[PDB]
Amino acid sequence: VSTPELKKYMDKKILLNINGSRKVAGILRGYDIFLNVVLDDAMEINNNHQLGLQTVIRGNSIISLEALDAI
Amino acid sequence: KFYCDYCDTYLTHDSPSVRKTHCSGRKHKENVKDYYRNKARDIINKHNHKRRHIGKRGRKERENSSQNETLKVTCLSNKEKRHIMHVKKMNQKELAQTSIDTLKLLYDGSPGYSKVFVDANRFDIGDLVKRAQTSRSRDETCESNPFPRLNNPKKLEPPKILSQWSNTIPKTSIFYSV
Amino acid sequence: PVNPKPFLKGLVNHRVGVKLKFNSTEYRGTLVSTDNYFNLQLNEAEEFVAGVSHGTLGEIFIRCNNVLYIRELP
Amino acid sequence: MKLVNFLKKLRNEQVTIELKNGTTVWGTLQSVSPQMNAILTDVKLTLPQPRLNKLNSNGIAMASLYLTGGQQPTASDNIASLQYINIRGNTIRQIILPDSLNLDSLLVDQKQLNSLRRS
Amino acid sequence: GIPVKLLNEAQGHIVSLELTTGATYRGKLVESEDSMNVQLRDVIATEPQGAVTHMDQIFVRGSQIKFIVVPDLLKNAPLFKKNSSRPMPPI
Amino acid sequence: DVSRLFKPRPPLSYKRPTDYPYAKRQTNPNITGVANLLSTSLKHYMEEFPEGSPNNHLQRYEDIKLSKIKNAQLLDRRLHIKDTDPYRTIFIGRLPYDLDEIELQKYFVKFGEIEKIRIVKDKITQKSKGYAFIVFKDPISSKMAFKEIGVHRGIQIKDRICIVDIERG
Amino acid sequence: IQVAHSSRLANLIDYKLRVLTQDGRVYIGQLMAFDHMNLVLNECIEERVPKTQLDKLRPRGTTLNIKVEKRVLGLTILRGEQILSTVVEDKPLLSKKERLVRDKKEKKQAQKQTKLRKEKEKK
Amino acid sequence: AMVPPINCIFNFLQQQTPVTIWLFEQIGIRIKGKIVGFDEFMNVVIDEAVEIPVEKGTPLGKILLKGDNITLITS
Amino acid sequence: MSTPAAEQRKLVEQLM
Amino acid sequence: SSQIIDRPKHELSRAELEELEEFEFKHGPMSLINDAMVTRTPVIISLRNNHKIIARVKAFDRHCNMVLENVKELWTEKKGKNVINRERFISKLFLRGDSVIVVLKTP
RNA sequence: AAAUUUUGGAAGGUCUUGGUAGGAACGGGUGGAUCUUAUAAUUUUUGAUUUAU
RNA sequence: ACCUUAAGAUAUCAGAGGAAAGUCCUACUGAUCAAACAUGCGCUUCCAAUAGUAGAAGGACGUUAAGCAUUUAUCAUUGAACUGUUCAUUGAAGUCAUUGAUGCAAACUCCUUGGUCACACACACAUACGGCGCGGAAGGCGUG
């Protein structure tokens, strides 16, 4: 329908809180109309253990997607 | 089909930037400014007062208030009250828009001036300023103007006083300043 | 590279064990039919609230929203 | 076949709507929106006490019941008599219909019968 | 819908919105979409237990928003009036 | 005066939450199984309601379905107009219900000679069902008359519109 | 207050409602628009029962007195997903006759202004 | 460049890269294995699925994991 | 075109 | 056959739409509930809030919300060691379809 | 039934209550409400907030 | 410079007529429903002292007020004494508050709101109470 306005967050480090407790930081690579996001070089902030080279996050469990860069 | 309610122009159905283009132009940027000026102007101009419930005064309450005196009512003509209302509204607007910035002029030569008062190189709201004035750069050092008093600055502006009470001022100053 | 819809079509009259997400409750039985929303009907299914089996169940209709995974038993 | 259409046929009858919180609303039932957005009028909200000493109750339900504004200060149990509570559709869990009505005359889906005759 | 259009009209002004997790956010509203996704700028966040921090931007999914507090002056918006006149849209 | 009017409210005060955290929110887990009920409570339920109440609203549904399955085979159930081949014979359709055989013969003789005429009427009542069979002395004349009566907005029926065409036999 | 039996959410415009949420928080403000049933409230103040005083509502002085923490927040649009149920509390400031009067007033003014706008924009 | 999540899952399927799927909490389990196929709604079939609590879990075989529970799919 | 599911179909179907 | 079943619901025609609904109710997972209504055998429905109901279905629907009579709500409330078994009888009941988990047909 | 009553209508009297500048008919590549279907598949209504084992 | 569209419908059943089976329509006809507008009910609730300096409803994001009673203010590493306790050092986070928070209660001050209407300063009532002045607000019900 309407693609979310994330064309300015491309290839910039962001930190988004999975569900209500987890917080994942990575480099955004793409997104879908459901607000699914694929972010590379993830790191589960808590010491903090990396996730993998390429992860996808279902847009249902995303709450906020604040960006840790110039934007 | 969605139209702007300020411009009143009927816009072919859009949802993307087409609505971010219309709302970011000038016929929808200042024509939405004139609208809310008028609506806020009204709520300033409103003079309707609360409903008045008048109770029948009793004898004990009437006799004392009738004893004292009658009080004269001051009244103006139509043109005079027109002029007075215009003056009062203008004075209210002028005072409401007034902002005091003496502290900004006082610290004009501070060692860390360009990083705080310039308001474009600040760290909190500088991210907004960072197609469209001799701006003060952040790279200024205190070596520039080692001695501020070398005729560079000017005297502090004298304090303002109310004009309607301008005859209240003392006639002569204590000392003779040239 | 089989998709879930052809997979669930192929699982018809096959012993499958579907587990709900609540209490590791697992139903093991033959799959009779499926809907486009993956509603499942099981025949002669046995209930496993845990590793212990509770009993035998005649025919159960399982709502689509509860199943966590549908797996093919050997 | 949509049971919301059957539910729309009551329209003036006493129901007992039990929400998902646990609170049960009793009152005359007015029109029902096609999303099951019930509108009851002469209602008497109540909260079932679980009858077990150590199991206390829902708490958010008590908060909502009191904040409705109709709770009797001297009431021993949690009841709040008020008029016209509008209930959102997704909150209803089950609706206890009256005993007296006939189901055979109300359950006949006129639209489905019309479609079957037309086909 | 009227509330979505009101949130659209509320662009460029400081709004305060509380999520379903308990957090609170306030700041300039850059952009909003028809599905209640909002982008706040210079937001001052209050995590549920009371701690307050600051971030440059944020993009919160609309499915989690509880309510959004816009400036009070928007009560006089032209799209809140019921009887309206239309320009007779062309062919 | 650009944004001097849209002054927002003061920041909202903080109150300690009274609900459950987003991480702790869940519906009821440990939902006990359904197998235990079948052994004990089902026997009591079946013993105390032997038989269920009749399903009456399906009666009307299956009744109207019976009409559909009853109309078709009954219409299909079946097997003065047995004249010669229709190469020279003419046929008419959509004639009046209260018309007669002599009037139809005269109308057909208005634009072609008639050798044999026999109108077939419905068996229920002695009223002309709107069909009249007229044998013509010239197939070309009969075809021309039929074409004229079909192109001229239908032949003049007493209480209807009577279009004409081939017998199609 | 008494409210008409045949009164949907469209009739309760400028009534001062009592909107209840899933998390035990109520909102008390004037309804001015709706839609998914997500309202717009004018001056709604949010109330809640603190966990320290929740225990007084449980069944057992004779009359309960609950101190409810309330926050002031203005012209807020709710989301229909969280709304649980709505109750009515107070009537609008204006009577029904005065409401009809102002509606007729604004309709007359709008018709005249539209006629003048057409007359200006054509010629 | 931009790669959609659907294309990322397609790449996982094509290169058979093992993935560890995070089922969301109050379930407290993870699934490790290889993606054989995915759907519209993030429904995935998994071969050689391994059950891991949150490492003494039991293999499950080939399963179809409904997408309404998936939270992450990381390699 | 209705819910985003149809649009995602008209992407996944081409992807396969 | 396969094409019409897999075919997205926004391009089939009206007649084929209600034909699909009837086919889903006759040959499908809800055929269980349809049979249970038709031969009038009790069903044991396990709700989301740990409530088991034993009743006879009189009308069901796409979203699996059914009208039931002779309902007998059975549920247990527990805390620690203590347990109490409570039961409630309801004459005629409407039931929303978002709560049900598994619907068992009586043997 | 031409005497009586009840029911319907016409006219007149009395009392009251409301209105007083628009209204009817026709029309369309006219706006908005309501309803049905896509739509029970991650962004609102076909259940993860009765705090549980 | 970007944009040019989800599709349908507008009370409902039953009866008569017109274009075998539907199909459509009727300034056709019944019954039900819904809306508007008039119009009524011995309908129900509410509408503030002046014969006085009051009172009712709702607020205060008001004061007394640091009120009266409780309760809170980090984690890891290393050294030293010590029978857990005390002192120092490195690293890690860390909403402000402690005149706070929470529990209880009272006085005071002030805001908005209302028919501050008319006739009365009156011996009533068991069928318990002329609801037998004009308006207004809000609902319930009935008719056209």
From Swiss-Prot, chain C:
Mark the transmembrane ranges: none
Q: Which GO terms describe its biological process?
A: 7-methylguanosine cap hypermethylation; mRNA 5'-splice site recognition; mRNA splicing, via spliceosome; spliceosomal complex assembly; spliceosomal snRNP assembly; U2-type prespliceosome assembly
Q: Which InterPro entries match?
A: Lsm6/sSmF, LSM_dom_sf, Sm, Sm_dom_euk/arc, Sm_F
* Compartments reported by the entry: Nucleus; Cytoplasm
Residues in domain Sm?
3-74
Cite the source lineage: Eukaryota, Fungi, Dikarya, Ascomycota, Saccharomycotina
Q: What else is known?
A: Present with 2570 molecules/cell in log phase SD medium.
User: Whom does it interact with, and what assembly results?
Assistant: Component of the Sm core complex, present in spliceosomal snRNP U1, U2, U4/U6 and U5. The core complex contains SMB1, SMD1, SMD2, SMD3, SME1, SMX3 and SMX2 (Sm proteins B, D1, D2, D3, E, F and G, respectively), and is probably a heptameric ring structure. SMX3 specifically interacts with SME1.
Q: What GO CC annotations are associated with the protein?
A: catalytic step 2 spliceosome; commitment complex; cytoplasm; nucleus; pICln-Sm protein complex; Prp19 complex; spliceosomal complex; U1 snRNP
What this chain does, per the entry, is described as:
Plays a role in pre-mRNA splicing as a core component of the spliceosomal U1, U2, U4 and U5 small nuclear ribonucleoproteins (snRNPs), the building blocks of the spliceosome.
Report the SMART domains cross-referenced here.
Answer: Sm
UniProt protein name: Small nuclear ribonucleoprotein F
Q: Does the keyword Ribonucleoprotein apply?
A: yes
Sequence similarity? Belongs to the snRNP Sm proteins family. SmF/LSm6 subfamily.
Q: Which GO terms describe its molecular function?
A: poly(U) RNA binding; RNA binding; splicing factor binding
Q: What is its main location?
A: nucleus
Q: Which UniProt keywords apply?
A: Cytoplasm, mRNA processing, mRNA splicing, Nucleus, Ribonucleoprotein, RNA-binding, Spliceosome
From Swiss-Prot, chain D:
Other facts noted in the record for this chain = Present with 2400 molecules/cell in log phase SD medium.
Q: Which UniProt keywords apply?
A: Cytoplasm, mRNA processing, mRNA splicing, Nucleus, Ribonucleoprotein, RNA-binding
Q: Which domain of life is it from?
A: Eukaryota
Offer one example of a GO biological process linked to this entry.
Answer: spliceosomal complex assembly
> GO MF terms on file?
mRNA binding; RNA binding
**Main subcellular location:** nucleus
Q: What does this protein do?
A: lays a role in pre-mRNA splicing as a core component of the spliceosomal U1, U2, U4 and U5 small nuclear ribonucleoproteins (snRNPs), the building blocks of the spliceosome. Also binds telomerase RNA and is required for its accumulation.
Q: One GO cellular component term, please give it.
A: precatalytic spliceosome
Name the gene: SMD1
Q: How does it assemble?
A: Component of the Sm core complex, present in spliceosomal snRNP U1, U2, U4/U6 and U5. The core complex contains SMB1, SMD1, SMD2, SMD3, SME1, SMX3 and SMX2 (Sm proteins B, D1, D2, D3, E, F and G, respectively), and is probably a heptameric ring structure.
Where, subcellularly, is it found?
Nucleus; Cytoplasm
Domain notes for this protein = C-terminal extension may function as a nuclear localization signal (NLS).
- Name the UniProt record assigns to this protein: Small nuclear ribonucleoprotein Sm D1
**Which residue numbers delimit the Sm domain?**
2-101
UniProt record similarity statement:
Belongs to the snRNP core protein family.
Q: Where is the signal peptide?
A: none
Curated annotation (Swiss-Prot), chain H:
Q: What is the protein's known function?
A: Involved in pre-mRNA splicing. Binds and is required for the stability of snRNA U1, U2, U4 and U5 which contain a highly conserved structural motif called the Sm binding site. Involved in cap modification.
Instruction: Look up the further comments and give them.
Output: Present with 556 molecules/cell in log phase SD medium.
GO CC, sorted alphabetically, is:
commitment complex; cytoplasm; nucleus; pICln-Sm protein complex; precatalytic spliceosome; spliceosomal complex; U1 snRNP; U2 snRNP
- Organism, per UniProt? Saccharomyces cerevisiae (strain ATCC 204508 / S288c) (Baker's yeast)
Q: What PANTHER family does the entry give? A: SMALL NUCLEAR RIBONUCLEOPROTEIN E
Q: Name one GO molecular function term.
A: splicing factor binding
- Gene3D superfamilies from the entry? 2.30.30.100
Name the chain's protein: Small nuclear ribonucleoprotein E
Q: Which residues form the Sm domain?
A: 6-75
Tell me which InterPro entries the record gives: LSM_dom_sf, Sm, Sm_dom_euk/arc, snRNP-E
For this protein, the record's Pfam families field holds:
LSM (PF01423)
Curated annotation (Swiss-Prot), chain I:
* Compartments (UniProt record): Nucleus
Q: What else is known?
A: Present with 2270 molecules/cell in log phase SD medium.
Q: How does it assemble?
A: Component of the 18S U1 snRNP particle, a subcomplex of the spliceosome.
Q: What does this protein do?
A: Component of the U1 snRNP particle, which recognizes and binds the 5'-splice site of pre-mRNA. Together with other non-snRNP factors, U1 snRNP forms the spliceosomal commitment complex, that targets pre-mRNA to the splicing pathway.
Which family, according to UniProt? Answer: Belongs to the Luc7 family.
What's the protein here called?
A: Protein LUC7
Q: Which organism is it from?
A: Saccharomyces cerevisiae (strain ATCC 204508 / S288c) (Baker's yeast)
Q: Which residues of the full protein are shown?
A: 4 to 19 of 261
